[PDB]
A paper describes a structure:
Recognition of N-linked glycan at residue N276 (glycan276) at the periphery of the CD4-binding site (CD4bs) on the HIV-envelope trimer is a formidable challenge for many CD4bs-directed antibodies. The glycan at residue N276 (glycan276), in particular, has been found to restrict antibody access to the CD4bs, an important site of vulnerability targeted by many broadly neutralizing antibodies isolated from chronically HIV-infected patients. Cryo-electron microscopy (cryo-EM) structures of these two antibodies and 179NC75, a previously identified glycan276-dependent CD4bs antibody, in complex with HIV-envelope trimer reveal substantially different modes of glycan276 recognition. Despite these differences, binding of glycan276-dependent antibodies maintains a glycan276 conformation similar to that observed in the absence of glycan276-binding antibodies.
We next obtained a cryo-EM structure of BG505 DS-SOSIP in complex with VRC33.01 Fab at 3.7 Å resolution. Similar to VRC40.01, VRC33.01 bound to an epitope that overlapped the CD4bs. Relative to the VRC40.01 epitope, the VRC33.01 epitope was smaller and shifted toward the outer edge of gp120, with less overlap with the CD4bs. Both heavy and light chains contributed about equally to the binding interface with gp120. Heavy-chain interactions involved CDRs H1 and H3, with CDR H3 dominating the binding interaction. We observed a salt bridge from Arg66C of light chain to Asp368 of CD4-binding loop. Glycan276 interacted with both heavy chain (CDR H2 and H3) and light chain (CDR L3), with the heavy chain dominating binding. Notably, VRC33.01 differed considerably from VRC40.01 in the relative positions of heavy and light chains. The orientation of the heavy and light chains of VRC33.01 were approximately 180° from the orientation of the heavy and light chains of VRC40.01. As a result, the light chain of VRC33.01, instead of the heavy chain as in the case of VRC40.01, occupied the position of CD4 N-terminal domain in binding the Env trimer, and recognition of glycan utilized a different set of atomic interactions, with the CDR H3 interacting with both N-acetylglucosamines and mannoses, and CDR H2 and L3 interacting mainly with mannoses.
Author numbering:
A (entry chain D), C (entry chain B), D (entry chain F): 520 to 554, 564 to 664
B (entry chain A): 31 to 139, 151 to 185, 187 to 309, 312 to 321, 321A, 322 to 396, 412 to 505
E (entry chain E): 294 to 309, 312 to 321, 321A, 322 to 347
């Protein structure tokens, strides 16, 4: 398989290839870093603005994934419950049938709620872990 | 035992004072107006719809307006943005030529307008035309005996004509801080510009600040909360101006008032100069009005405050500006696209124990920011113009007599350009977050 | 509460908000990335220099926190002892009473020492862990 | 010892100083961030292009180290075997005698193979760890 | 090495345009002698001895 090749796969079988999207998400800067000494400086500026935008996108995703308990992991389990309000579909059908493109729109509305649950659950969990290491 | 171990915290609420590059934001409605038209309408990012301020409880912070680096960024931005607006406009060099002149024709109150005739290129390089324009006496000088004259700038630089679609009008500019920095507002109504503010709020952008320019009186700026406030860097030093901020406005009206005709001369292929063609009515002097009772009352408030700093029995009096160049001795401001210098000697001569009319003069050739080279010719504007404004406050200088100590004389100070917006940036401080911190507690890492 | 809102709190109750400061410390680039098609490119340069400075500040803090044993954690316990020379204040008074603004200046002198202790303790600790995984 | 001071050391004793290269790898931007206000903008462009290139190099190394299991660690044991085709030298001679410069050339060819093995071993491992937490 | 003009030479300004001036070479105050440089002979003769070596 190649980049995005699983996009029309079912979500289940798409899970075993997440690294393929992940590497390309930044290292595609290889095209722009490949190259006049100053003249036509605007073409430099068009590349340069695109480069800082590319690192900011990556860095925001890593930051967000790191205020949750997940930094440096491609899969992560958590400790906040899935209210059926977020989706009334059963577990089997979403992992069996849907593509990731389909699933994303079908939960799009609730997303900004769910990140708040994760964030607050994590910070109080780190304090509970310090409250233990104070005597462990 | 309570053995103590260092523990790290990240995202700690703590900060330090810093120099950092703020960035503008501009009104998202005005942003829809045509490119370069005033002050980066198109290029300055459109506004965040709210100042998202948070009152910081219990904190006390050392504000200082006189040292505030935020003013230098505004001054430097304004200069840079001003020059960037003029770069595309015509350099007026071919107009630097010998002028014959005569005094103006129809009725006058005094020969301030010269009617002048000269030879000017057509677009066709080999063809040139005799032509005439009016000019004000301040725009020209006599090279002589014989009535031979030149423009005032011809022996020092060639001015750009200002592009006539561009307006100088000061739209509100917000200043905003980049990520990892924050603005603090001092909220205390009694803050005098230097010391511990006891009520602070963070915000991501300032309120709108308008880039007005004037000397002796501050115009259209923000009014003080409860009373006239007077601020100084170090008040026993005569070299430092007192800034006075009013509680009410005082309304000022000002008018050209003559009916003036634009005319175009096509100097070159795709280049044209706006001559001052003719005056349609009979001629009357440019002037401003202020309502006398409101002024007489307002200086009563200003004295009531100065008395606190200098002592109750001081015989405080005002006087006009001493002497020197027109640009430093007078009100020096723009109305509607035209540049007014007005004789404030009518206001400043009270002593302490209906409308005033201020006469004015006008220049077309100008040098704001006072560079040696750079110069503007501001083209004439059609018809009649007048505008209304609020005097917000004023700049005073206290004269250093080795005299009897019972009295102080204050004069309208002229002042540096910065004070036109240091009168807003007194409330704002900028800080750098220091989000990483360490502290002891009794825990251990597992091993 | 909102951004910086705990700054006049005692350190104890301030310890729960840290995610708020942490998110705003980079994501505030949302203002600058919101926007002339090239003309007045200098205002682009004023934004662009601020953007690279914003990521460098964040990235240095993450690097430093990552050569200590703390990457991706907002609270972290350690294993180097607190020399009372750094502060003779008892544990209770500092967590009970002081604000973070107050505490920072009161240990500002020693801070550059403490980072060196943490660094060296961590690297020898990782090598001791390899000396164990060599047979575990 | 200072920056790179162990480069002619045996690999063994060089292992205890990795932090000295690591901190200098990014924080050296202190030289470039230390400064004219717009004019000669080209020198600003030289600094600015160098700064984005420096953070991109650092992010790429951290990303690569984080699609493997290793993010936030200077040493890491793993779970893929060392085929002697990569080097027929015994374990003792390389840790005793060679310098890191000498080692790098002597394995240079195989490197792009080895990174692929590491990546794949990790992603299937994270899914195996979820297959456990699904019932624990 | 020492080197010298050595003539006593006069700057003059011609104002070619509005805010533009050209620096003419106005006059020579002394009588005229050629620009030249000196080097100490023994040090040069010795130095080429080293270069040949
Ligand atoms: C702050 O406030 C003070 C007080 O009002 C102002 O002082 C006045 O300033 C004006 C302008 O300089 C003075 O008017 C001028 O006076 C000159 C001196 O007059 C004497 O000498 C001449 C020549 O020897 C005699 O003819 C004359 O009789 C006096 O003996 C005159 O030379 C000036 O002449 C010009 O104006 C007249 C106007 O009619 C023309 O006819 C002339 O051709 C010529 O253009 C002029 O008259 C005035 O005298 C000052 N008043 C006092 C009481 O001193 C300050 O100016 C003010 N500051 C600012 C910045 O506004
Ligand atoms: C202190 O603050 C006050 C209030 O903001 C300022 O006063 C205003 O100043 C602006 C200019 O800066 C004035 O605007 C001008 O109005 C002219 C007339 O049009 C207006 O009024 C008529 C009815 O009288 C309406 O029909 C019309 O819709 C407008 O509302 C315009 O001609 C001016 O220029 C425009 O037209 C020309 C010719 O086509 C174009 O070249 C221009 O680009 C532009 O499009 C301009 O719009 C405004 O009228 C003033 N208001 C008052 C109450 O006085 C002060 O200027 C300010 N002081 C300082 C020192 O900053
Ligand atoms: C594009 O969609 C198709 C349809 O899902 C994917 O192909 C394979 O389709 C079959 C059904 O036609 C899926 O079911 C399984 O088929 C095998 C025989 O191939 C059978 O032994 C099993 O009992 C079961 O019925 C199969 O899961 C599916 N393949 C995958 C990888 O899921 C096709 O792969 C999709 N394209 C891409 C690139 O994702
Ligand atoms: C503007 O344009 C006109 C036409 O190009 C210039 O006309 C000048 O006209 C006079 C004739 O009146 C020419 O001759 C001189 O006249 C005076 C008396 O006026 C006389 O004393 C002299 O002996 C001589 O005959 C004059 O040469 C001519 N000028 C040129 C440059 O051709 C006029 O000078 C221009 N004015 C300006 C201020 O540019
Ligand atoms: C460029 O042209 C101007 C005008 O000839 C030269 O400057 C000076 O301009 C003033 C005002 O027209 C002349 O009057 C004197 O002004 C002073 C101002 O402080 C005032 O104190 C005196 O009472 C008097 O009114 C002045 O004579 C004139 N010339 C000089 C030498 O100052 C300017 O110098 C010229 N610059 C160049 C580079 O050619
Ligand atoms: C604006 O308000 C602040 C207070 O909110 C005023 O602060 C003044 O700070 C000076 C610092 O020098 C104090 O003056 C003297 O300080 C020396 C020590 O440096 C001390 O030995 C003297 O006894 C004296 O205290 C001053 O007391 C303090 N307060 C006052 C009423 O001035 C600041 O001066 C105010 N400025 C204006 C223009 O209103
Ligand atoms: C400033 O000086 C000019 C001189 O050019 C005045 O404008 C008018 O200039 C024309 C020639 O360009 C003059 O000549 C002719 O006058 C007769 C009068 O019957 C008229 O029928 C022709 O169409 C032509 O205009 C004209 O006399 C002159 N006008 C006046 C009133 O002097 C200009 O008016 C002077 N003053 C001002 C305020 O600009
Ligand atoms: C700014 O305005 C003042 C107004 O005070 C101008 O100064 C002079 O003011 C006096 C009154 O203080 C005027 O007095 C009159 O002078 C004539 C002189 O012949 C006399 O006949 C009258 O009996 C009366 O005394 C004076 O006209 C006025 N001077 C002028 C030239 O207007 C001051 O000049 C103005 N500022 C500037 C820079 O011009
Ligand atoms: C402040 O400025 C005003 C206006 O420039 C000065 O007011 C004028 O003061 C004089 C002397 O007190 C008044 O008295 C006399 O009036 C007659 C008739 O006009 C005149 O012939 C005398 O020569 C003398 O001026 C004068 O009426 C008055 N002018 C006005 C328009 O009210 C005032 O003196 C200045 N100083 C102070 C301390 O207010
Ligand atoms: C600004 O400072 C005040 C004062 O510390 C903070 O408010 C709260 O103050 C009370 C004391 O009045 C602290 O103690 C608690 O008081 C209640 C009764 O009022 C009592 O039931 C509790 O057992 C306890 O003694 C309280 O801890 C303190 N709040 C916090 C969050 O510590 C105020 O919070 C400060 N501002 C900010 C933004 O934190
Ligand atoms: C540059 O290379 C030399 C040679 O490896 C490094 O110095 C030290 O050399 C000795 C052998 O001459 C190494 O072996 C050990 O020597 C001690 C006695 O000094 C002995 O007690 C031990 O049993 C063992 O034989 C020693 O390991 C080596 N030092 C290091 C740090 O490996 C020299 O340090 C190298 N320079 C740098 C900065 O790496
Ligand atoms: C404008 O009018 C004034 C006053 O009539 C003129 O000034 C006088 O001109 C004559 C002749 O050149 C001189 O002898 C006088 O000395 C001048 N008086 C003063 C006070 O300077 C002036 O020449 C006219 N200017 C123009 C351009 O027409
Ligand atoms: C300014 O002009 C308006 C309209 O004529 C008028 O209502 C106002 O009272 C004037 N104010 C002054 C100070 O003249
Ligand atoms: C000056 O007047 C004020 C207001 O009445 C008063 O508070 C102050 O004590 C007075 N001081 C003197 C020395 O008269
Ligand atoms: C100026 O004069 C012309 C001709 O009389 C007229 O069309 C115009 O309306 C006048 N403007 C004013 C403000 O009176
Ligand atoms: C002048 O002051 C009044 C005070 O109510 C304010 O409403 C107005 O916006 C101010 N500005 C102008 C130009 O009138
Ligand atoms: C150069 O000039 C200085 C000062 O006259 C003198 O001391 C030196 O010896 C000269 N050297 C030569 C090579 O002439």
């Amino acid at each position: 398989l190649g980049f995005l090749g699983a996009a029309g796969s079912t979500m289940g079988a798409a899970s075993m290839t997440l690294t393929v999207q992940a590497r390309n998400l930044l290292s595609g800067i290889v095209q722009q870093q490949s190259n006049h000494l100053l003249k036509l400086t605007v073409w430099g500026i068009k590349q340069l603005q695109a480069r800082v935008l590319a690192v900011e996108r990556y860095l925001r995703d890593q930051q967000l994934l790191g205020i949750w308990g997940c930094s440096g992991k491609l899969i992560c389990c958590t400790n906040v419950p899935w209210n059926s309000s977020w989706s009334n579909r059963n577990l089997s059908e979403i992992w069996d049938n849907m593509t990731w493109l389909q699933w994303d729109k079908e939960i799009s509305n609730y997303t900004q709620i769910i990140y708040g649950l994760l964030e607050e659950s994590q910070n109080q969990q780190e304090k509970n872990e310090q409250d233990l290491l104070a005597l462990d | 035992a309570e053995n103590l171990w260092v523990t790290v915290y990240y995202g700690v609420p703590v900060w330090k004072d810093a120099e950092t590059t703020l960035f503008c934001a501009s009104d998202a409605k005005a942003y829809e107006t045509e490119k370069h038209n005033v002050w980066a309408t198109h290029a300055c990012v459109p506004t965040d719809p709210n100042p998202q301020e948070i009152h910081l409880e219990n904190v006390t912070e050392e504000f200082n307006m006189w040292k505030n680096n935020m003013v230098e960024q505004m001054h430097t931005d304004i200069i840079s943005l001003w020059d960037q607006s003029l770069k595309p406009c015509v350099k007026l060099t071919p107009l630097c030529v010998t002028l014959q002149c005569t005094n103006v024709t129809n009725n006058i109150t005094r020969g301030e307008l010269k009617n002048c005739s000269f030879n000017m290129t057509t677009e066709l390089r080999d063809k040139k035309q005799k032509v005439y324009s009016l000019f004000y006496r301040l725009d020209v000088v006599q090279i002589n005996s014989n009535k031979e004259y030149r423009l005032i700038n011809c022996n020092t630089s060639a001015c750009t004509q200002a592009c006539p679609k561009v307006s100088f009008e000061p739209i509100p500019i917000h200043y905003c801080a980049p990520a990892g920095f924050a603005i603090l507002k001092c909220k205390d109504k009694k803050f005098n510009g230097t010391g511990p503010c006891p009520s602070v709020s963070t915000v991501q952008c300032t309120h709108g600040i308008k880039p007005v320019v004037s000397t002796q009186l501050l115009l259209n700026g923000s009014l003080a909360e409860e009373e006239v406030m007077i601020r100084s860097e170090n008040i026993t030093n005569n070299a430092k101006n007192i800034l006075v901020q009013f509680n009410t406005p005082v309304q000022i009206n000002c008018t050209r008032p003559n009916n003036n005709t634009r005319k175009s001369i096509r100097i070159g292929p795709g280049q044209a100069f706006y001559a001052t063609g003719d005056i349609i009515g009979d001629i009357r002097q440019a002037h401003c009005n202020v309502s006398k009772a409101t002024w007489n009352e307002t200086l009563g408030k200003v004295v009531k405050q100065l008395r606190k700093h200098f002592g109750n029995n001081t015989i405080i009096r005002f006087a006009n500006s001493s002497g020197g160049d027109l640009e430093v001795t007078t009100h020096s401001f723009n109305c509607g696209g035209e540049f007014f210098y007005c004789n404030t000697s009518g206001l400043f001569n009270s002593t302490w124990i209906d409308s005033i009319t201020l006469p004015c003069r006008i220049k077309q050739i100008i040098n704001m920011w006072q560079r040696i080279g750079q110069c503007m010719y501001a083209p004439p504007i059609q018809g009649v113009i007048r505008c209304v404004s609020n005097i917000t406050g004023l700049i005073l200088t206290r004269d250093g007599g080795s005299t009897n100590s019972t009295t102080e004389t204050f004069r309208p100070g002229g002042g540096d350009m910065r004070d036109n917006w240091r009168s807003e940036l007194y409330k704002y401080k900028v800080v750098k977050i220091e989000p990483l911190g360490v502290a002891p507690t009794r825990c251990k890492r597992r091993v």
